[PDB]
Design a protein around this ligand. Structure first.
Ligand code: AAH
Lengths: 217, 219
């Protein structure tokens, strides 16, 4: 029955600013006898969800005071005054008055910081992996910002496509930057067939596209 | 003090069963309601159901999404929480958590146990080195890592030098190769001056295939 809808789904806040989030229920969540059990949980990258506010404004243990719960009946809001690197992750609201229990859609939170260009590295296929019969070339765009970043492979100045896939890490709780890995996959054969392997990275933080390459195969 | 450790996760054929367990310690197990909550990779949390404390006849409640197909129970003389699942489908694939509920809501959560529903069989990965490219181009700072390739199912653990190495360590999200086998890299950045006095080893561990590998990355 009950439907918990959070908003926004995403939220870009500047280190130090104030953040606000809403959780609207389908019906009053005032547990008949007593009060209203509306909680706020927060999940940080690679961790488990953790309690923040229980009843509605009730702040759990070691939780800073920057967090404050509020609202009643069908409108609740979680506010974080003076946001920072650590508060990164997804926030969720939970209704614990009516069964079945309900979980909010989930509001993500990314931290905006000054522009940082990616540092590029390029690794040729291991010898051990070549014995196998396949070669994996890996390009690394390390600690950059914003998230957007292009990567193109060129085997002998020839552009490539549909033979490589990427993977981006989640914003770092430290410097709030991203990292990306690209892997060019080719058969041991075709790899022997060429000479120059290059990785060309494009980013807002770069004034002129940077390139990393190597001559072997 | 309070400890909630779940297990029993792993790979399972579509249509089969798998019972999960959650070990607790550090509080009066029978005074609390015990909850089960799953989360598919990259998606939102989904309340599954709970079992009330003793004061309420240990009654169970389930989420419409799993009711009748899933069951919860508890061993009080041992303080263990259970979750029996049946006729599992591919979508049931997720990380399952347990938590206790009481005067402070779900104040304590477990670290989770991952589940995968697939007809595909287990497979240990192969680990190759992302060697500090010899002529490490214009840079006093070098990058090196390990390539964990061709494994199934997820997940795979990767630490450096038994955990001691933590600075500038990035483990990327696994991706699916056209072969239906996962793959992922783990990098670390350090000074190029020390590529002769230091040692770097990635300790990769799988589990669904009982695989442990400690590969020492070298220039
Ligand atoms: O009557 C009482 O004192 C118990 C409070 C009623 C709420 N109970 C237990 C209950 C559920 C959730 C919380 N919380 O903090 O989130 C606290 C207590 C729900 P149910 O009747 O078993 O579905």
């Amino acid at each position: 029955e009950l439907v918990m809808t959070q908003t926004p789904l995403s939220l870009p806040v500047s280190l130090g600013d104030q953040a606000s989030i809403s959780c609207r229920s389908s019906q009053s969540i005032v547990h008949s006898n007593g009060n209203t059990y509306l909680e706020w949980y927060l999940q940080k990258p690679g961790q488990s969800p953790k309690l923040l506010i229980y009843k509605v404004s009730n702040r759990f243990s070691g939780v800073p005071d920057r967090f404050s719960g509020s609202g009643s009946g069908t409108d609740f809001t979680l506010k974080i005054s003076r946001v920072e690197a650590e508060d990164l992750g997804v926030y969720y609201c939970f209704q614990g008055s009516h069964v079945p229990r309900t979980f909010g859609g989930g509001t993500k939170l990314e931290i905006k910081r000054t522009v940082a260009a990616p540092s590029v590295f390029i690794f040729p296929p291991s010898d051990e992996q070549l014995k196998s019969g396949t070669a994996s070339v890996v390009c690394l765009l390390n600690n950059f910002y914003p998230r957007e970043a292009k990567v193109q492979w060129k085997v002998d100045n020839a552009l490539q496509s549909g033979n490589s896939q990427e993977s981006v890490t989640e914003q770092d709780s430290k410097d709030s930057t991203y990292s990306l890995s690209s892997t060019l996959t080719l058969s041991k054969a075709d790899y022997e067939k060429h000479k120059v392997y290059a990785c060309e990275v494009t980013h807002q933080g770069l004034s002129s596209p940077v390139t990393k390459s190597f001559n072997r195969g | 003090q309070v400890q909630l450790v779940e297990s029993g996760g792993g790979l399972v054929q579509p249509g089969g069963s798998l019972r999960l367990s959650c070990a607790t310690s550090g509080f009066t197990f029978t005074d609390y309601y015990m909850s089960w909550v799953r989360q598919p990779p990259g998606k939102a949390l989904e309340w599954l159901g709970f079992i009330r404390n003793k004061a309420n006849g240990y009654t169970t409640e389930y989420s419409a999404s799993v009711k009748g197909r899933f069951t919860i129970s508890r061993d009080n003389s041992q303080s263990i929480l259970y979750l029996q699942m049946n006729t599992l489908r591919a979508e049931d694939s997720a990380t399952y958590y347990c938590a206790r509920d009481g005067s402070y809501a779900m104040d304590y959560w477990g670290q989770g146990t991952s589940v995968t529903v697939s007809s595909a069989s287990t497979k240990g990965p192969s680990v190759f080195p992302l060697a500090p490219s010899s002529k490490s181009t214009s840079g006093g700072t070098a990058a090196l890592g390990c390539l964990v390739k061709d494994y199934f199912p997820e997940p795979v653990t990767v630490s450096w030098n038994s955990g001691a190495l933590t600075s500038g360590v990035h483990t990327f999200p696994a991706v699916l190769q056209s072969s239906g086998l996962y793959s992922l890299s783990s990098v670390v950045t350090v000074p190029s001056s020390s590529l002769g006095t230091q040692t770097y080893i990635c300790n990769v561990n799988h589990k669904p295939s009982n695989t442990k590998v400690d590969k020492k990355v070298e220039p």
